[PDB]
Design an enzyme around this catalytic site. Structure first.
Site, PDB file in Angstrom:
ATOM      1  N   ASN B  83       0.700  -1.594   0.159  1.00 57.56           N
ATOM      2  CA  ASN B  83      -0.238  -0.024   0.153  1.00 57.56           C
ATOM      3  C   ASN B  83       0.536   1.226  -0.106  1.00 57.56           C
ATOM      4  OD1 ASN B  83      -2.478  -1.371   1.492  1.00 57.56           O
ATOM      5  ND2 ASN B  83      -2.754  -0.428   0.040  1.00 57.56           N
ATOM      6  N   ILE B  91       1.750   6.743  -0.582  1.00 56.06           N
ATOM      7  CA  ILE B  91       1.091   6.342  -0.141  1.00 56.06           C
ATOM      8  C   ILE B  91      -0.336   5.865  -0.859  1.00 56.06           C
ATOM      9  CG2 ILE B  91      -0.292   5.790   2.358  1.00 56.06           C
ATOM     10  CD1 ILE B  91       2.146   8.082   3.053  1.00 56.06           C
ATOM     11  N   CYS B  92      -0.989   5.029   0.215  1.00 57.54           N
ATOM     12  CA  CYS B  92      -2.233   4.233  -1.026  1.00 57.54           C
ATOM     13  C   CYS B  92      -3.157   3.962   0.595  1.00 57.54           C
ATOM     14  CB  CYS B  92      -2.308   3.461  -1.629  1.00 57.54           C
ATOM     15  SG  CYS B  92      -4.285   3.274  -2.219  1.00 57.54           S
ATOM     16  N   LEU B  93      -3.519   4.930   1.126  1.00 56.47           N
ATOM     17  CA  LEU B  93      -4.281   4.696   2.941  1.00 56.47           C
ATOM     18  C   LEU B  93      -5.904   5.933   2.452  1.00 56.47           C
ATOM     19  CD1 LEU B  93      -4.652   4.442   5.842  1.00 56.47           C
ATOM     20  CD2 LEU B  93      -2.428   6.394   6.466  1.00 56.47           C
TER      21      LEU B  93
END
Lengths: 156, 199
Positions: B83, B91-93
């Site tokens: 992620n 970031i992929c949050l």
């Protein structure tokens, strides 16, 4: 030597899988076998659309035991007419200078391409051959048909 | 910047400095400028995870439209996580995206990032290669992440296997980071990573 042979064994393996079509690079034989990986018979075709179009210029490619810590010596066989090439045939170039722009990662592939791209585009501030420099600095077309004729000397 | 948002940052910056999580060295935050457009964050890798003992430097940017748009967070310290981009640290949050709410402090942000480290979402990936290494081969993913934690983030040393291969390829003359990337990507098979390093 142990270090150098290892990397070169792998360098050829990768080159055998893929190279820029038309180039040559191959380890020489030792008498009886063997095979000599620290001496290469190599060839470069001058990129099309240039005066260097239509020619195949041969160079030897010698490796020291330091390699890849040190670069290979690159010698054109026979000596080539080029401002950046020494009258003994040795290619003079930053990426090929030990304490300048050589780096241990640099592949044989990238050397041969780097030399190929040095062919039409020369490095004026860095002269290796008097006669070729002497020309390029005043009458370009005299250098041009010189390149045209030199490429014509080498069958495709 | 904007009066209102500036007093928020200073409140949040203070909240974090005084938090339990900071006194226990799990997170920290520091300012850069007078202007509060930019903060420096740090998180401890959570326990029982491949990132344990790691320490991760975070670049926090606050856009003109904060608090209503989220802060822009990127990993400075390289990390192997499905992620986060292994290359840029993008970031992929969920909470910096479409689960973001304006009441969310910097403390809440930093703790969520620690949480994302203990709970991947490989079905919504930032790094294709990593996510696929996660799903297809969990055990390899755990070892690979653990190695990065050791080399980039200062975590206690990894798997003999992986390092043998690295200092084998670096002895061949290649660049460590390039080597590490290759092996990690070509799933620790020497032959293929080697042909990549030439490329």
């Amino acid at each position: 030597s142990g270090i150098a042979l290892s990397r070169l064994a792998q360098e050829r393996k990768a080159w055998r899988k893929d190279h820029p079509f038309g180039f040559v690079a191959v380890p020489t034989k030792n008498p009886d076998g063997t095979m000599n990986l620290m001496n290469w018979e190599c060839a470069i075709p001058g990129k099309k659309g240039t005066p260097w179009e239509g020619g195949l210029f041969k160079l030897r490619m010698l490796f020291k035991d330091d390699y890849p810590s040190s670069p290979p010596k690159c010698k054109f066989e026979p000596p080539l007419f080029h401002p950046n090439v020494y009258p003994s045939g040795t290619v003079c170039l930053s990426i090929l200078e030990e304490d300048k722009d050589w780096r241990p990662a640099i592949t044989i592939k990238q050397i041969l391409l780097g030399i190929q791209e040095l062919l039409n585009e020369p490095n004026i501030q860095d002269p290796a051959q008097a006669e070729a420099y002497t020309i390029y600095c005043q009458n370009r077309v005299e250098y041009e048909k010189r390149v045209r004729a030199q490429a014509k000397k080498f069958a495709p | 910047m904007a009066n209102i948002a500036v007093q928020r940052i200073k409140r949040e910056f203070k909240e974090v400095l005084k938090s339990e999580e900071t006194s226990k060295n799990q997170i920290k935050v520091d300012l850069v400028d007078e202007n509060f457009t930019e903060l420096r964050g740090e998180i401890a890798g959570p326990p029982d995870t491949p990132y344990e003992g790691g320490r991760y430097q975070l670049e926090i940017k606050i856009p003109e439209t904060y608090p209503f748009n989220p802060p822009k967070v990127r990993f400075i310290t390289k990390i192997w996580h499905p992620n986060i981009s292994s290359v840029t640290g993008a970031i992929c949050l969920d909470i910096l995206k479409d689960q973001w709410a304006a009441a969310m402090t910097l403390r809440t942000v930093l703790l969520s990032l620690q949480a994302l480290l203990a709970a991947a979402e490989p079905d919504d990936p930032q790094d294709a290669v990593v996510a696929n290494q996660y799903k297809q081969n969990p055990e390899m993913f755990k070892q690979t992440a653990r190695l990065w934690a050791h080399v980039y983030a200062g975590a206690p040393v990894s798997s003999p296997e992986y390092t043998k291969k690295i200092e084998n390829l670096c002895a061949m003359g290649f660049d460590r980071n390039a080597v590490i990337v290759a092996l990690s990507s070509k799933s620790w098979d020497v032959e293929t990573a080697t042909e990549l390093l030439l490329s």
